[PDB]
Design a protein around this ligand. Structure first.
Ligand SMILES: Clc1ccc(-c2cn[nH]c2)s1
Length: 407
């Protein structure tokens, strides 16, 4: 019996920041006065783009006050325009407590949609930039063994350029900046750039601006206290193609960007995805630990190599990673196995939820029972299917589980 997935309107994006739809304004090998101060980097990234235009709503938020989102973006541009006149650019920028920001900061079954599988496919892909250093992975006090080192070097070469690794580092930066601001500027509506850093194929260091968040008041006495925030994120994705994906956003058109393409230079609109959101201390601490996704999925790989080494009474690291008993790789390559394991780990983090917890545990129990039944030939379903409500990541993993059943 396959799991019964819920009927209803398509599910919508619920991640803390854009994934496949993000857009970056970037600067190469930066060397301005104050390189490495987020606000300074953001302004320089902002100053590389000249296609800004009078913004307007193109996909209104059905349940929100759309003029306040518009006003909120215009305030960001205006207050950055002010900073450009203050001869000493401040280290941080606290927004005026305008009515639009006071509103935005707080003073149902859903069916599976195709976009979540597309997000996952996108997370498995390679990018043309590296997002981590060679020795990023691991925490060991002592120097590591030769074998462990070999395994780490092989794995890193496969995932350093991976999109899921960008999501890790993007998530790590934004959660660190937000948690630090929640502490250092409790009463301020601080402007917090969304930044990442990477190294191009040619070795050039590069700094990336995805957009901005503004945080609300944050007197976070405990781990579950919530700080509100507004996110404002660049994108080339036209929201009118998949509006169900964007139920929680107000989307603006804010510029036009000139692009290289397969058909030569082309001009495409630049959008700004705006929503209100919230997070807590404990979620921000987990966001800061997303590099553990790299360690956890390496350990799944090492688990596999250690099994092959136990059978062949010999270390199989080179044989495993160079693909040289197994006669192929189901995902196509060892590299794609690494990136797929990583993407599952990262999405478990980006889409963490009680629904995911229940589905994970309960579907595992049903798995083993189905395996043992195969190899040798209700109730648990209620536990599994009770978790299938509206979360895109859970619904996709259920769709995946159902394929595992037909085969
Ligand atoms: Cl930094 C900034 C770069 C561009 C800005 C702008 C755009 N429209 N009005 C002001 S502020």
């Amino acid at each position: 019996r396959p799991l019964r997935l819920p009927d209803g309107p398509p599910c919508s994006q619920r991640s803390k920041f854009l994934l496949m739809d993000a857009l970056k304004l970037s600067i190469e090998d930066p060397s301005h006065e104050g390189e490495g101060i987020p606000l300074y980097d953001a302004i320089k990234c902002m100053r590389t783009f000249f296609g800004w235009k009078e913004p307007n709503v193109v996909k209104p938020h059905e349940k929100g006050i759309n003029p306040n989102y518009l006003l909120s973006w215009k305030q960001v541009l205006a207050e950055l325009q002010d900073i450009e006149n203050e001869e000493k650019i401040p280290r941080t920028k606290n927004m005026k407590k305008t009515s639009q920001l006071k509103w935005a900061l707080g003073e149902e079954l859903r069916s599976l949609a195709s976009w979540i599988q597309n997000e996952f496919n996108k997370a498995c892909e390679l990018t043309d930039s590296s997002w981590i250093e060679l020795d990023e992975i691991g925490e060991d006090a002592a120097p590591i063994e030769h074998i462990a080192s070999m395994r780490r070097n092989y794995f890193t070469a496969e995932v350093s350029h991976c999109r899921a690794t960008e999501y890790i580092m993007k998530g790590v930066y934004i959660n660190t900046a937000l948690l630090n601001a929640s502490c250092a500027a409790m009463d301020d509506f601080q402007l917090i750039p969304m930044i990442s850093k990477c190294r191009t194929k040619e070795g050039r260091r590069k700094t990336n601006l995805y957009g901005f968040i503004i945080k609300g008041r944050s007197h976070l006495r405990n781990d579950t206290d919530v700080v509100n925030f507004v996110s404002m994120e660049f994108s080339l994705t036209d929201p009118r193609l998949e509006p169900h994906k964007w139920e929680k956003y107000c989307v603006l058109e804010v510029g036009d960007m000139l692009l290289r393409s397969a058909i030569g230079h082309v001009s495409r609109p630049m959008f700004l995805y705006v929503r209100t959101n919230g997070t807590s201390k404990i979620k921000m601490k987990w966001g800061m630990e997303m590099r553990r996704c790299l360690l956890q999925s390496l350990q799944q790989i090492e688990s596999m190599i250690e099994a092959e080494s136990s059978v062949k009474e010999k270390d199989m690291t080179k044989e495993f990673f160079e693909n040289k008993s197994p006669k192929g790789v189901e995902e196509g390559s060892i590299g794609k196995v690494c990136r797929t394991l990583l993407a599952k780990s990262v999405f478990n983090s980006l889409y963490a939820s009680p629904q995911l917890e229940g589905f994970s545990a309960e579907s595992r129990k049903l798995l083993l029972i189905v395996q043992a039944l195969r190899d040798n030939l209700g109730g648990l379903y209620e536990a599994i299917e009770e978790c299938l409500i509206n979360d895109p990541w859970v619904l996709l993993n259920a769709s995946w589980f159902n394929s595992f059943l037909t085969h």
